[PDB]
Write a protein that binds this DNA or RNA. Structure first.
Ligand SMILES: [Mg+2]
Ligand SMILES: [Mg+2]
Lengths: 296, 296
DNA sequence: CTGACGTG
DNA sequence: CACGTCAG
DNA sequence: CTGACGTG
DNA sequence: CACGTCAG
């Protein structure tokens, strides 16, 4: 009798795509969590975000979907939780990361800077671990005022009132190999949704997993054996993001992956040379292999 | 192998009790929705809330539970979504309504005044409809600031950061009889979590079901056929709360039975007459009986 | 790599 | 809106 | 009815 | 804390 006309629906079921899964927040119009698994093969290939378009997820009821009109002109950028750069292997997978079900309102500088560098480090880990799992998502955390009152405040944007998070979180779980007798590596990080420089190290944003679960109301990787050997990812690995020089270099390399015209190449080396940087052996070895191909 | 260690858990599964069900919000430490079914029989009985105590729900993971320490001294009252008064028929059901999984931080005046009167009206509906279903819960809505920005802002209380809602909602669905071909009657209401006098009629807080679903991120009564004719409950019924005199007389009537001394009983009568409220014959019967017993 | 912005 | 251009 | 508080 | 007392 109680359930004669059904229980209310919260819409939090896991939604699976080609190379990520998420749970959606219908009230805030953003994901609660986005889970991915990266390996060196996934991050290679010819998929190109220039052929992709942000758009509502066709599997989300339109009443609870965000739309591009919510974001454009808002002063907030569209920030993908599963990044396009993790899906070079499949045009379909990359396009599915442009569904707004994967997007939160993100500070432009953060999206293009510190958070970008965290994503780059997650990819770097596949050079050292066979398997890497990442859960990313938004948070709206309280601030404590001087009188002890704790208050959650956040902006909502657009006709659809899309929630702008105060912070973003990432949980990284890395397994060296399938046969490894070695412990798993785990780290949880919470970063404010704002411009962050190159000075603060990633460890300054590290939190215990239990604290993140309390803050987010989520349980991550719930099948994990609690007596298994898990260590702090920042003690068995570096947790070292790219510095300015290496970040500018990396970006330039990503740009030599692409080739459109000569004068473009000119502008590239122009801005790069205004900041010195001696091309290290890697960017050179990757410079000739492409230069030859292009003049061919 | 993306799900190697399981998907993250959000904890929103429906939880069923003797005479209500709820979905719990582990981040805010309050229910998202509480569903109940009321009839003539369930609101009769000897269940007494003086035998009950607010306590954590033993089925909620302690990590995500509220505790009484979060509420005591906070300035906010414990506000039940499924009310004790709907569970006079069963001491077990009543006890379960005092689990903190059914509780939100509620303005004291609102809890004991306007919201109390809405609850009373839900019970009144069982005099004219055989079956009444009600979904109740908290809401944290934005305000539009002077500069046009829309901001959500709410307090979180206690060491567990229990979220204080800005508003409370109720959806009421009423069915005349199980075999009747009369359309069902439905209403949705959104009330601010603050003191509300006797002046505003309940219809001033009515909203369309669609608007409440968009604001709450929920779909209510998903098995209700919305394409068949459904009546506005404030059209087919009264949506009239008890007015000051009726409310005060009802409260005084219930206070008669609790009075422990002649002083307190007599002061109940004095307050009534001081406000120019006339007692009714039933009230004077109970009052004279109790007064005789306490004097003796 | 991460995106928005201005012209059609 | 598309799409080239620009920017961190 | 709805609740918070003060004492063995 | 459990209980009795008090207030909206
Ligand atoms: Mg991004
Ligand atoms: Mg109440």
């Amino acid at each position: 009798v109680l359930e004669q006309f059904g229980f209310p629906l919260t819409g939090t079921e896991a939604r699976c795509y080609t190379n990520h899964a998420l749970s959606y927040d219908q009230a805030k119009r953003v994901p609660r969590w986005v889970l991915e698994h990266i390996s060196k093969s996934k991050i290679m290939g010819d998929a190109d975000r220039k052929h992709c378009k942000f758009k509502p997820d066709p599997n989300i009821p339109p009443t609870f979907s965000a739309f591009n009109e919510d974001y454009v002109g808002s002063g907030w950028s569209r920030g993908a939780m599963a990044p396009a750069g993790n899906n070079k292997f499949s045009s379909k997978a990359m396009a599915e990361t442009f569904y707004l079900s994967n997007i939160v309102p993100q500070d432009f500088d953060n999206n293009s800077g510190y958070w970008n560098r965290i994503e780059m480090y997650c990819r770097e880990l596949t050079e050292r671990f066979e398997d890497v799992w990442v859960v990313s998502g938004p948070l709206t955390l309280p601030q404590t005022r001087g009188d002890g009152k704790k208050i959650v405040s956040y902006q909502v944007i657009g006709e659809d009132n899309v929630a702008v998070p105060s912070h973003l979180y990432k949980v990284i779980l890395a397994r060296r190999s399938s046969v490894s007798t070695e412990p798993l590596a785990l780290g949880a990080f919470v970063v404010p949704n704002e411009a962050i420089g190159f000075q603060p190290q990633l460890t300054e944003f590290q939190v215990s997993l239990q604290d993140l679960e309390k803050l987010s109301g989520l349980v991550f990787f719930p099948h994990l054996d609690r007596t298994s050997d898990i260590r702090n990812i920042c003690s068995v690995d570096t947790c070292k993001l790219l510095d300015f020089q290496e970040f500018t270099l990396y970006l330039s390399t990503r740009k030599i992956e692409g080739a459109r015209s000569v004068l473009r190449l000119e502008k590239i080396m122009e801005n790069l040379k205004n900041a010195e940087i001696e091309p290290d052996d890697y960017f050179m070895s990757r410079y000739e292999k492409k230069l030859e191909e292009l003049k061919a």
